[PDB]
Ligand binder design. Sequence first.
Ligand SMILES: Nc1nc2c(ncn2[C@@H]2O[C@H](COP(=O)(O)OP(=O)(O)O)[C@@H](O)[C@H]2O)c(=O)[nH]1
Ligand code: NA
Length: 307
Amino acid sequence: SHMATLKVIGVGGGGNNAVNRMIDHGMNNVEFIAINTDGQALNLSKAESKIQIGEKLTRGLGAGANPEIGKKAAEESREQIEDAIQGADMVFVTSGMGGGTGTGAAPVVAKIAKEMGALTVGVVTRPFSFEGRKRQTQAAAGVEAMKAAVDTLIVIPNDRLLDIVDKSTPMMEAFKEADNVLRQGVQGISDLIAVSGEVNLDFADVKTIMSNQGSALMGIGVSSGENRAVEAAKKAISSPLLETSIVGAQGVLMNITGGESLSLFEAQEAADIVQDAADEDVNMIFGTVINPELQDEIVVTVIATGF
Ligand SMILES: Nc1nc2c(ncn2[C@@H]2O[C@H](COP(=O)(O)OP(=O)(O)O)[C@@H](O)[C@H]2O)c(=O)[nH]1
Ligand code: NA
């Protein structure tokens, strides 16, 4: 009856890098919008919809690390941004904080989406410490601005990438790991919408957990064999890349997908992992999907808010 329209918007260089790598990976039923001052980068964007902002301000260059330029470029193009969003039920705005375009334009894009009624989720990075204190300070101002403009915000400090690489891991492979946070969040919501689960969750449940909330965690875990439900739930709530951990979550959207062997006992085990890890009484919105194609595998999806 209702088919929710999801859009992913990349703002500035890193945000548009994320959009390009996600399109390359493959994502059906999601629409991508690339927003940048940098016309050279936009010409290389794989996104179906591209918006060059601030051409008269920047003559087609980036914003040169000045967030005021990004902010003015986005406001001067509000109509174009609204046209690109129109029809969206949910908008993911992804951006690297600390530069000129993302820091200044991403909060404007999010505000536009929110006042179009879209469930608006920000997924943003903080700069590496080696990029210096000014960049960290600019980024912090952009994070605060994003928080004021979105329904829910996921922050990925780039410094956490240094916790998951070895000395040889290519930087592009590290960036793909940060990409997965957004990509797997979008996909879990897309999967939730597409299927009528045995205990069904739908977009209105996503809205209940994410609307007007603040910090969020999105995660997915997949496991097989003995103890699969516990292991998958631990993976879903344990990202080394997130600023916001599960601890102190008070609302959780949790979906469990399994084959016909999905037992009541292990659904409780998985739910209990999330309750006990949050260390709070969690308002859980719980769903289950029996996908008989799956054999021994189980999938746990978690969206946590209420901090
Ligand atoms: N994780 C990740 N971070 C990025 C990427 N590109 C840029 N960044 C970070 O994002 C910050 C802003 O850079 P960028 O998006 O290119 O600046 P902007 O285009 O002016 O908004 C940089 O300081 C880096 O910390 C990326 O592809 N992945
Ligand atoms: Na569903």
